[PDB]
Design a binder for this molecule. Structure first.
Ligand code: MG
Ligand code: MG
Ligand code: MG
Ligand code: MG
Ligand code: MG
Ligand code: MG
Ligand code: MG
Ligand code: MG
Ligand code: MG
Ligand code: MG
Ligand code: MG
Ligand code: MG
Ligand code: MG
Ligand code: MG
Ligand code: MG
Ligand code: MG
Ligand code: MG
Ligand code: MG
Ligand code: MG
Ligand code: MG
Ligand code: MG
Ligand code: MG
Ligand code: MG
Ligand code: MG
Ligand code: MG
Ligand code: MG
Ligand code: MG
Ligand code: MG
Ligand code: MG
Ligand code: MG
Ligand code: MG
Ligand code: MG
Ligand code: MG
Ligand code: MG
Ligand code: MG
Ligand code: MG
Ligand code: MG
Ligand code: MG
Ligand code: MG
Ligand code: ZN
Lengths: 138, 124, 99, 208, 150
RNA sequence: AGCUAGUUGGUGGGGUAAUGGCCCACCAAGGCGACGACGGGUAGCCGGUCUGAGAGGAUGGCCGGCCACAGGGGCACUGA
RNA sequence: GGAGGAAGAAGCCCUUCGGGGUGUAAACUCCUGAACCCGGGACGAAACCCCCGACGAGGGGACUGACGGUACCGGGGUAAUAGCGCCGGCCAACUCCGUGCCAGCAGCCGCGGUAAUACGGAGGGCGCGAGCGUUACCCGGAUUCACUGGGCGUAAAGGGCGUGUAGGCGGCCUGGGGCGUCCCAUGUGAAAGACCACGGCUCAACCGUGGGGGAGCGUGGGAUACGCUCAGGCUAGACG
RNA sequence: CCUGGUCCACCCGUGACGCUGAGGCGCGAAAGCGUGGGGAGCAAACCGGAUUAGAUACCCGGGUAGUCCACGCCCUAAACGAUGCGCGCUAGGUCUCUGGGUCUCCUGGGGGCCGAAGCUAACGCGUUAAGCGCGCCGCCUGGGGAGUACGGCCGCAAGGC
RNA sequence: CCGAGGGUAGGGCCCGUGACUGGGGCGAAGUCGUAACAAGGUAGCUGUACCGGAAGGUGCGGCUGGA
């Protein structure tokens, strides 16, 4: 019945990329779009549009991957090598502003819901706020 | 374990057993000799280790190893006990601090002598 | 300020007093997860106007008796036995954990 | 304290050469020029590869036997540096060098450090007026390391004050040989220092 | 032709009617100290030989260790086998703190400021293979947003 | 693993510098507990101190703040 | 104690009987002078108190030092204590002789059975130095109680299987409150310690000043994504 | 005859009413126990016969409880997939059981083998996961001592937790 | 009246200790056998029951970690 649709979403993606794939379709959500908006806007995907599979709203999310490689196992590098959720439904993980993590030395992103919209490690540090550290992506 | 589970059960501290009860966790302990025998070694070794059962001040009683070569310890002598087992003589778990009270330092030894308690000699 | 609390009257069986069960929550000091945890306070009611099932604000008051350092501030919403049941069931569950 | 014993013997062992002595180490007889092999009954034998540990030991030992300082103080300093901000590699030396009994060695006043020591401790040296018998006394930036009135007149301060006329000295130092009174310009920069020692390896030996 | 310094060597053995034949193993690291290194494992009927092969293989398999001040771009963790390895960059002037294997490797890779830590199985061989695949996975802000084009 | 007779509450009194079952008469039958009541064991508590990459772990001698006791126990007098 | 000093004394230890070692170490030669010897010798102490003014604000005058003739200053001045730990591996430091599963070593793996770098003595070497070793306890290594940060097919670890109480956990949309949560302001968070600077005693240890931080918790204000709560709706879970 | 679960089809109804689950409660192979029936075959025990240095055994001839039924206990196990349950997600191939369709084909549940990716110490796992994730319960923390002791609770006992 | 405590009586927990008894650990080279590991020379293990100097045997059902 899904408990955290988000960790799901993210997993949907983690699994998607593993074999590389046009897109994958998380079921729609005004928060999942939100989260997704920051993947594309930060360049982890091509993007997403609404769709449907018989009355049921989803999100076609078009992935992104690296350039074909040489040598054995010529599968591309991954645009998203790692995406694991922080705050979980069984342990909400909140953070003040000075506590906010520094993913991978700026190379990654700490998406995180806040009192003024879904920001990120840099975005929130600027606006000077905090909130439920949603997850770390790189 | 889940997080909720830790909120219930929670992790359990180890707490370790005192390899030696020299009592009061004191540095050393004094005691009088009850018997002064000579026991034999364990698995692959062979010898005649010089040992003593000591009657501590703590109404206890324990066997104890006697360092060095040759000693001077009798059924009524007064020893100070140190503590370190002997990976060879099941039973012995304390050492005799040489050259203190009725315990005489090692005779004619010259090498490492903090251990073995013999005084530094003169060359002449 | 005179510390105020909010909770459910779970017992009306005293003369001029009610037991107000009081829930509260916080982040676990090592394991994060927020955790509910409650306490019962005995509250003065010099008019016995408060009945079994009310939610109420209580206020740190000067000692009325032993065990009793709170007056019932004001009502917050009558008729809420659902929470009282939550309490009573718990209480009743006990019988089955002895010998 | 300050070692005190056979020394053209660690001039040895450390392989690399040092001048605990001063003059004689220049001779064609530092014993180093004569026996390239570390001391003891063995010495000249097929020397087995040093276990990583050994390496880091010999290094730090080298660097220490140079200023012939106490393991404690060396360490003290090390930690002191480690605490203070900056690349501990250099800064450890900076202070290792600021040691009076060393700042007085680099300003010609003496030939060996073991001589430069007995110099400071015997009050023969002095600073901005007041004399100092404190080998450990760390010199800051902008200080006058003169000699003393009762000391200007020594056959030994002189003979070392002698060949020193003209000879050049570290960039962080300035000597008015006439008035036999040297200054300390600044805290040295790594290069300014030339020693046979990879500071890195020391810093590592203490991460044991 | 590079630095070439060998990690560990071991004698192994196999049984056969009449006693125990042997063999020797050599793990070797290779580097110029600019950001080039390679790991090489070589077994053979004798010490000298084995070590040789070690070097040969070492060169065959080398990785572009992309420094950024004599240190490292980002912090990484990698499990190969039962062996986990942590790599954290230090500010200039620190030292390369690690155990034989990880250190060894990292010196010739030309690092100078790195925090490490072996976890799990501290089997040299597998810590080796471990570290490589860590370095082999190093990215700079460049090659990063180089993939976030679109 | 069940606890409880001043026990929980109430009216009226006594007591104090003052609240209060602190104490006393009477009335109601209550109070507490797996969020660990009751019981057993061990311990003065903190600012700190030690160690550790840190989160933690251990610790509370010197110095500073509070508590407690003055051979064991009980009581009150004087008095701000 | 410092500077010089042999292709290098003796003694002593190895020796493939040529030699190698301690070792510039010593002797030996010069120069400095810990101690001790003589003289000088405080800061800590300006108030209280007396006079004028008013017994006040302001001005002046005098008494008082336990440590103590000690610190510190000036002169003279003698070469003037070294010790303990270890050297099989971890872990740095190697060879003779004795010994012969004996005597003994030992934190672990182990050593000693007639050639022992592992016992005991020696020569040498490493290490630290007014110390060095040992025993006892705390933390660390121990990612071996794991929040950071582990696990359960066969290594230790899935309850023999259900039903269900409390509890934990909660799908899509809309709004109200703002309890969690986030921000700002302010009170509090003594001093001492710590930590960054600066000086005070010859440095240092100790010590002063100044600054900077401290989670928490109270108070006021604000935000409303996520969690919570109240309310209205949906059909993808669930049920019929 | 009485009754449970379970899958399919139609998209009709309610509109999150869900998942898990400390304790509790129920069920729980064989053997074993109580009361009362039942007894052919088999068969602990036990008796014989061989074998054997011996043979309290293996092989042979007998044979009692038991094995069966009714009611009540006991509550253990290699109670084994040695794999807790629920949900989402990540190639296919092959045969097999059983539904449904404008049926050489598609689709839905179930049971097997080979296997992408990925996991794994390895063996192996692999849409019936040991993959990748969330929820909740149980459990492990070196071997022997020892599932022993003591206490407690349950049991008629054996013994169980 | 209350009251330190003292007295009588009866319970609860904990430590020590005791003729004797039970098993358990360790012990360079003891006695009796051979149970297990290879079809272990009767596949093994297993819960239970009965039995036997001892490992063990057998009965019933189970597991393959056997064939
Ligand atoms: Mg032996
Ligand atoms: Mg692993
Ligand atoms: Mg009372
Ligand atoms: Mg006490
Ligand atoms: Mg740590
Ligand atoms: Mg008293
Ligand atoms: Mg060595
Ligand atoms: Mg020894
Ligand atoms: Mg020896
Ligand atoms: Mg370490
Ligand atoms: Mg720990
Ligand atoms: Mg965890
Ligand atoms: Mg583990
Ligand atoms: Mg197991
Ligand atoms: Mg199961
Ligand atoms: Mg089991
Ligand atoms: Mg429920
Ligand atoms: Mg403070
Ligand atoms: Mg409707
Ligand atoms: Mg259920
Ligand atoms: Mg049966
Ligand atoms: Mg029967
Ligand atoms: Mg038969
Ligand atoms: Mg028959
Ligand atoms: Mg049964
Ligand atoms: Mg089966
Ligand atoms: Mg199927
Ligand atoms: Mg398969
Ligand atoms: Mg399939
Ligand atoms: Mg044990
Ligand atoms: Mg057991
Ligand atoms: Mg049992
Ligand atoms: Mg019992
Ligand atoms: Mg009494
Ligand atoms: Mg058998
Ligand atoms: Mg057999
Ligand atoms: Mg058999
Ligand atoms: Mg059986
Ligand atoms: Mg039989
Ligand atoms: Zn020299």
């Amino acid at each position: 019945m899904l408990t955290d649709p988000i960790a799901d979403m993210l997993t949907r993606i983690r699994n998607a990329t593993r074999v590389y794939k046009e897109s994958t379709d998380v079921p729609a959500s005004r928060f999942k779009e939100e989260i997704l908006r920051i993947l594309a806007r930060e360049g982890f995907i091509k993007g997403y549009e609404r769709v449907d599979v018989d009355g049921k709203p989803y999100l076609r999310v078009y992935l992104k991957y690296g350039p074909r490689r040489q040598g054995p196992d010529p599968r591309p590098e991954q645009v998203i090598h790692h995406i694991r959720r922080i705050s979980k439904p069984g342990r909400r993980v909140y953070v003040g502003v000075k506590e906010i993590p520094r993913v991978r030395r700026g190379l990654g992103i700490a998406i995180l819901s806040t009192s003024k919209g879904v920001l990120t490690d840099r975005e929130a540090r600027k606006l000077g706020v905090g909130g439920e550290l949603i997850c770390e992506v790189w | 374990p889940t997080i909720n589970q830790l909120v219930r059960k929670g992790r359990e501290k180890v707490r370790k057993k005192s390899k030696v009860p020299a009592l009061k966790g004191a540095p050393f302990r004094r005691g009088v000799c009850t018997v002064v025998r000579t026991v034999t070694p364990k698995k692959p070794n062979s010898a005649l280790r010089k040992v003593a059962k000591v009657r501590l001040t703590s109404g206890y009683e324990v066997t104890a190893y006697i360092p060095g070569e040759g000693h001077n310890l009798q059924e009524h002598s007064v020893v100070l006990i140190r503590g370190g087992r002997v990976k060879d003589l099941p039973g012995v778990r304390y050492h005799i601090v040489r050259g203190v009270y009725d315990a005489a330092g090692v005779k004619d030894r010259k090498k490492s002598r903090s251990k073995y308690g013999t005084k530094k000699p003169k060359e002449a | 300020p005179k510390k105020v609390l909010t909770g459910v009257v779970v017992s009306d069986k005293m003369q001029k007093t009610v037991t107000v069960l009081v829930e509260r929550q916080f982040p676990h000091p090592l394991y994060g997860k927020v955790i509910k945890r409650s306490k019962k306070y005995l509250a003065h009611d010099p008019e016995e106007k408060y009945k079994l099932g009310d939610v109420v604000e209580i206020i740190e008051s000067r000692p009325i008796s032993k065990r009793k350092r709170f007056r019932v501030l004001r009502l917050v919403e009558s008729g809420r036995m659902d929470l009282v049941e939550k309490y009573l069931i718990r209480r009743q569950n006990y019988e089955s954990l002895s010998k | 304290g300050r070692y005190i014993g056979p020394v053209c013997r660690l001039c040895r062992r450390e392989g690399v050469k040092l001048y605990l002595k001063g003059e004689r180490c220049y001779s064609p007889k530092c014993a180093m020029e004569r026996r390239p092999y570390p001391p003891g009954q063995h010495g000249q034998k097929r020397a087995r590869r040093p276990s990583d540990y050994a390496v880091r030991l010999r290094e730090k030992q080298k660097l220490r036997r140079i200023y012939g300082i106490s393991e404690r103080q060396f360490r003290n300093l090390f930690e002191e540096a480690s605490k203070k901000k900056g690349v501990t590699g250099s800064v450890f030396l900076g202070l290792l060098e600021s040691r009076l009994d060393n700042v007085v060695y680099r300003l010609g006043f003496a030939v060996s450090r073991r001589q430069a020591r007995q110099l400071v401790r015997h009050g023969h040296i002095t600073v901005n007026g007041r004399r100092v018998d404190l080998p450990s006394y760390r010199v800051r930036p902008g200080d006058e390391i003169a000699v003393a009135e009762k000391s200007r007149n020594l056959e030994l301060i002189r003979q070392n004050l002698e060949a020193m006329k003209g000879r050049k000295v570290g960039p962080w130092l300035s000597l008015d040989v006439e008035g036999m009174k040297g200054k300390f310009l600044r805290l040295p920069d790594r290069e300014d220092l030339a020693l046979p020692v990879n500071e890195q390896l020391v810093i590592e030996f203490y991460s044991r | 032709d590079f630095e070439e310094k060998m990690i560990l060597i071991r004698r192994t053995a196999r049984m056969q009617a009449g006693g125990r034949r042997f063999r020797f193993g050599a793990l070797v690291v290779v580097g110029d100290r600019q950001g080039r290194v390679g790991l090489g494992f070589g077994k053979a009927p004798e010490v000298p030989l084995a070590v040789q092969k070690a070097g040969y293989y070492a060169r065959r398999n080398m990785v572009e260790v992309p420094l950024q001040n004599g240190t490292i771009p980002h912090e990484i963790e990698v499990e190969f086998g039962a062996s986990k390895i942590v790599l954290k960059p230090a500010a200039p002037g620190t030292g390369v703190i690690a155990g034989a294997v990880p250190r060894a490797i990292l010196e010739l890779a030309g690092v100078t400021d790195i925090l490490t830590k072996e976890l799990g199985s501290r089997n040299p061989i597998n810590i080796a293979y471990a570290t490589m695949e860590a370095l082999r996975q190093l990215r700079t802000k460049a090659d990063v947003e180089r993939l976030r084009k679109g």
